[PDB]
């Protein structure tokens, strides 16, 4: 019997035949390590995007910002990261401040819930708010 640990928390005679010698006289071109380093980055799956979705309790995740503002901020973060990877002060490829007037662009954020209402107050808080306005207690 064998067991495998989880990666995520759960609910709880001569033999030297004449062709085996080694003459490592060949250098790959392009180099093996060089290609491996590049493809290592491309292996990685794209990042999760949890924002705007509910949690175990029912309250949505994210930050209370306008959707258009959130999209713009994400574009700026992308440009800054792009500059970071290219080892330059200013990114040559920019996702923000392009020619296109993308003023109607929206991005998913935690400001709005599934009903289309505002998350100024969390879902669970409103549910408790409503359900406690109707309870009754023992007589005097």
């Amino acid at each position: 019997m064998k067991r495998i640990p989880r990666k995520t928390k759960g609910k709880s005679p001569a033999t030297t035949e004449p062709g085996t010698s080694n003459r490592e006289q060949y250098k790959a071109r392009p180099g093996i390590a060089s290609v491996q380093r590049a493809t290592e980055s491309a292996e990685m799956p794209m990042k999760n995007n949890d924002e705007g979705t509910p949690d175990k309790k029912g309250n949505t995740k994210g930050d209370l910002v306008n959707e258009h503002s959130e999209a713009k901020d994400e574009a700026d973060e992308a440009t800054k990261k792009q500059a970071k990877d290219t080892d330059k002060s200013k990114a040559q490829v920019t996702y923000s401040d392009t020619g296109i007037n993308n003023a109607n662009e929206l991005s998913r954020s935690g400001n709005v819930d599934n009903e289309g209402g505002s998350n100024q107050k969390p879902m669970s808080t409103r549910i408790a708010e409503a359900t406690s306005a109707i309870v009754s207690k023992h007589p005097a």
């Binding site: 007037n101 993308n102 003023a103 109607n104 929206l106």
Partner: protein, 50 residues
Amino acid sequence: EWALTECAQGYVTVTSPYAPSVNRLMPYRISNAERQISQIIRIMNIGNNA
């Protein structure tokens, strides 16, 4: 966008998005009658006041 371009006589170009919007509210259009009424009031006090 159309109004601004015409006023600038074509020297300045401005752009607007072309996609489903969030249905904003920008109350900036009034009638020529109201504009003239406001202009007459403005003329009244400024008159004879250099």
